[PDB]
């Protein structure tokens, strides 16, 4: 079994249903999850 | 863009780089990554 996730943000980002304590929101992807940018300290 | 993501403990648990603070790692994916297992808590 796969998921196929969205990488949003002009391929800078995740779609989640919510974002990780060292990402940042930048949006909302169209099936409605958090767009997630990842800060350099996530990794 | 989109990234295929192994569901992994048998249609469970996702693969990740490391598990989210409510989850539960119960092994290893085969590409390296975490299998990570939510608690009720999670959501």
Do not use: V
């Not at 796969?2 to 391929?11: A, K, N, Q, S, V």
Request: charged share 35%; net charge positive; with cysteine.
């Amino acid at each position: 079994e796969f998921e196929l996730d969205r990488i949003c943000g002009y391929g800078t980002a995740r779609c989640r249903k919510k974002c990780r304590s060292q990402e940042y929101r930048i949006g909302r992807c169209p099936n409605t999850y958090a767009c997630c940018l990842r800060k350099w300290d996530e990794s």
